[PDB]
Amino acid sequence: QPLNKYPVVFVHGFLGLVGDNAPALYPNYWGGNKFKVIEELRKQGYNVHQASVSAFGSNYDRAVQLYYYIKGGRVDYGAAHAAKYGHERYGKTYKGIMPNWEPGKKVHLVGHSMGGQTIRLMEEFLRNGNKEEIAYHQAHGGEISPLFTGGHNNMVASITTLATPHNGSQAADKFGNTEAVRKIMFALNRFMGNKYSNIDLGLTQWGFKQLPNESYIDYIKRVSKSKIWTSDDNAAYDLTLDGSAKLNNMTSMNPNITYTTYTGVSSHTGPLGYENPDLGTFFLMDTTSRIIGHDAREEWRKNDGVVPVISSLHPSNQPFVNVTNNEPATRRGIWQVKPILQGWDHVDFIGVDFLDFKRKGSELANFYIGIINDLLSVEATE
Amino acid sequence: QPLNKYPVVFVHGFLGLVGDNAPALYPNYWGGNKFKVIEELRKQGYNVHQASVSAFGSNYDRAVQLYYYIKGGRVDYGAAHAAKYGHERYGKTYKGIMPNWEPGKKVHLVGHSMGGQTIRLMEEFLRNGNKEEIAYHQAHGGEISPLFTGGHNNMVASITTLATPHNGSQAADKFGNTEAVRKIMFALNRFMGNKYSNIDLGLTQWGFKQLPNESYIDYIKRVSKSKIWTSDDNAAYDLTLDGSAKLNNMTSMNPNITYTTYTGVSSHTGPLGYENPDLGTFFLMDTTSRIIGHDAREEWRKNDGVVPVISSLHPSNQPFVNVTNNEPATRRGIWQVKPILQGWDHVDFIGVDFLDFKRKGSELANFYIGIINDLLSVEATE
Ligand SMILES: *OC(=O)[C@@H](CCCCCC)[C@@H](O)C[C@H](CCCCCCCCCCC)OC(=O)[C@H](CC(C)C)NC=O
Ligand SMILES: CCCCCCCCCCC[C@@H](C[C@H](O)[C@H](CCCCCC)C(=O)O)OC(=O)[C@H](CC(C)C)NC=O
Ligand SMILES: CCCCCCCCCCCCCCCCCC(=O)O
Ligand SMILES: CCCCCCCCCCCC(=O)O
Ligand SMILES: CCCCCCCCCCCC(=O)O
Ligand SMILES: CCCCCCCCCCCC(=O)O
Ligand SMILES: CCCCCCCCCCCC(=O)O
Ligand SMILES: [Ca+2]
Ligand SMILES: [Ca+2]
């Protein structure tokens, strides 16, 4: 029946909220009003889905949630990890988009921003398990999620990344992960965990859910004891250069998977060597773009508003090949780097810059159909 | 002591709120965060003021209100006018900015958007009175406001208008005047009249103020009977082509007043001869710009986003002369039409397009100093 033999799962980045979990007024993540990715691709005959995973959590908490979003079941972050970071072992429970997901039945994974990192960690868990959980289950018995055991291959056909900070972003190191902004973020999470909230921001495993009989005052008091306030097991840390390099160091190439990256630039060179945002960079990124563009190291400057080009092209020290837009993108085991999209800021990729009339719906539609054609090539040349 | 002999009064347009009356988060009307008109001109030794008048009311209502803002006193709309339109005769009471304003002690008047029309009407009342109120006062005794008496001359030095729709705007005829949109506007005025509201949107003469012991239900019932819902005594009607033509058909040139106008363009010709908004036109004006720009009469197309050029230049039936940027703007009795400001949209005049990096503070600084230097000239040459 569907044109693609393997389902496509789109994975959102940091601050992303999709589907039922989006606030009452909030942009449609995959395509804004420009090209409604999920709905239009379904209409054309493709089987596509929009994953929903923590908007503020770590790559690790998100990757476990992605496994359960696809497979179904109750999220198990692992006993060793829960105990090490001081959050709940068990999280939400998902119905599962493909409850029969197993070696043989594969999925295509497409990630935007942080979603690109989360996809890689999940593949890493399927193939290799999680050593600390294996050791923990060895020493203490109990149950271990099959996500953590390793040995599970032929489950992912492809990994495609769009403006992913594979090597981190200075917009995290210098704002985002600063004390003052982590506090803003975490206050927002506490608020949206109140007894009348229908929207889950992705940190309830740290205690941010007010109980039905608990006053707000007591809730503030309970949740100020949470480890979240000083932990690294969160997105803001993960997106920093250190945080993303930890992830690069624990991943490896799968020789069966087709890897491919897209990257945009939306900065231009100032007469001093520094990069400044183009007119029509989504305006919420004027400051983050300047921070990146004024880096001491010249090759870290060119950026999309919030991720530097060097971070998006591919994980550093992982094999890659610059590829053209024409040729098939059909090589396995190697990051295929697509030519830089000129004038595309971070959010032009998902269509939510409603202020920018140069980036047209017809264009974004061609962009996503181009990905889908590549994914169909991957299937045809298996 | 102040460098200008006559005080300069700036008059906001439709939807404008200023000072104490501005909502909690709301732009600083006179210069945004670009150039703080009032505070900076004061700092440079000029005596300037921003009038606070009705944001949604008619030119008539607003002109009466302007008179009291300057003079001090209890707003009197006139008994004939209150009885013909169906609203309160009396309104707000103003402390007065020049309590001794009389023939001999002039004021300079500058108006943005509808401000410019309001200013023309107030001066018509000062000079020639309101004949309807005279004949009401003939018939029934009681009091007549001096604003309606007539023969007050030599009270305003100058009328200068920025992006004022002297001949209306189709954005009113099509948008901002229609039934469905009048309802939205009146709805909001109803709500801002609630008994916890500290902000006055300027239609409380029509019944829009909740009593302290009146429930919101009874308020709705009561104000439902107001004539506001079907009247023309309102801004939306007055900004239409017929609305503004009516004001033109009853104003005339005072030959001792110095008249000058300014006009912005922020549209460009498309391949069919229609006008579309430039990149940079404040985005809340995209649709209104297209409505104007697609007019069937070619001369009505070029626009600043919300007012067509042919409307801003001069009242169509009054005398004018195209003036250069450098000629001292010193002629009495004739609309001196300043050259069009290329790339300036409707709101770049007051500096609030925080999204347009091409329109800088220092540009807006020179523009306003420009206006003051021309007012100084008016003084210097009596
Ligand atoms: O996952 C990501 O790709 C992430 C890239 C890393 C950048 C780290 C920055 C901390 C990125 O998308 C994050 C970006 C953040 C936008 C910053 C907002 C700052 C407000 C400042 C106030 C204005 C005056 C200075 O997130 C988005 O673009 C976001 C989600 C993306 C995944 C698209 N938008 C949609 O919700
Ligand atoms: C930072 C936020 C800026 C908001 C600007 C949004 C403009 C939306 C369209 C509103 C129509 C325009 C209406 C025009 O001014 C109006 C022109 C006539 C237009 C008729 C169409 C209703 C006028 O000149 O008084 O209103 C605004 O731009 C207002 C105040 C205006 C006196 C400057 N903006 C609010 O301050
Ligand atoms: C116009 C009156 C609306 C007031 C109702 C709610 C009270 C809160 C006030 C703040 C909202 C003001 C809306 C105007 C938004 C523009 C402000 C901006 O440019 O940041
Ligand atoms: C009345 C429902 C309130 C919904 C919460 C607002 C969420 C803020 C996001 C604003 C961005 C936008 O939707 O344009
Ligand atoms: C439109 C954004 C409003 C931000 C107001 C600041 C309040 C911050 C503290 C929040 C803590 C909490 O409510 O749990
Ligand atoms: C336009 C602002 C967004 C909120 C929409 C509320 C619509 C309610 C209309 C009735 C106004 C009233 O409460 O008197
Ligand atoms: C978050 C704001 C999005 C605005 C999208 C552009 C379409 C708005 C149409 C005209 C706006 C108005 O004046 O009400
Ligand atoms: Ca953009
Ligand atoms: Ca502008």
Numbering used by the authors:
A (entry chain A), B (entry chain B): 4 to 385
Give the authors' words.
We screened various chemical libraries and discovered that the anti-obesity drug orlistat is a potent SAL inhibitor with an IC50 value of 2.4 μM. The crystal structure of the SAL–orlistat complex showed an inhibitor-binding site and atomic-level details of binding interactions. Notably, the β-lactone rings of orlistat molecules were decyclized by their hydrolyzing ring cleavage reaction with SAL on chains A and B. Ser116 attached the carbonyl carbon atom of the orlistat tetracyclic rings at the active sites. Then, orlistat covalently bound to Ser116, with the oxygen atom of Ser116 and orlistat maintaining the bond. SAL monomer bound one orlistat molecule each in a similar manner. The oxygen atom of the hydroxy group is hydrogen bound to the His349 side-chain nitrogen atom (2.67 Å). The Ser116 side-chain residue covalently bound to the carboxylate group and shared one oxygen atom with both SAL and orlistat. The other oxygen of the decycled carboxylate group formed hydrogen bonds with two nitrogen atoms of the main chain Phe17 (2.97 Å) and Met117 (2.75 Å), which form the oxyanion hole. The terminal N-formyl carbonyl group of the amino ester moiety was located in the hydrophobic pocket formed by Leu18, Tyr29, Pro30, Tyr32, Val350, Ile353, and Val355. The α-side chain of orlistat was also primarily bound to a hydrophobic pocket, which was formed by Ala174, Ala176, Pro168, Leu242, Val309, Val310, and partially Phe17 at the bottom of its deep active site. The SAL–orlistat complex also had an open form, with the lid region located as far as possible from the catalytic cavity.
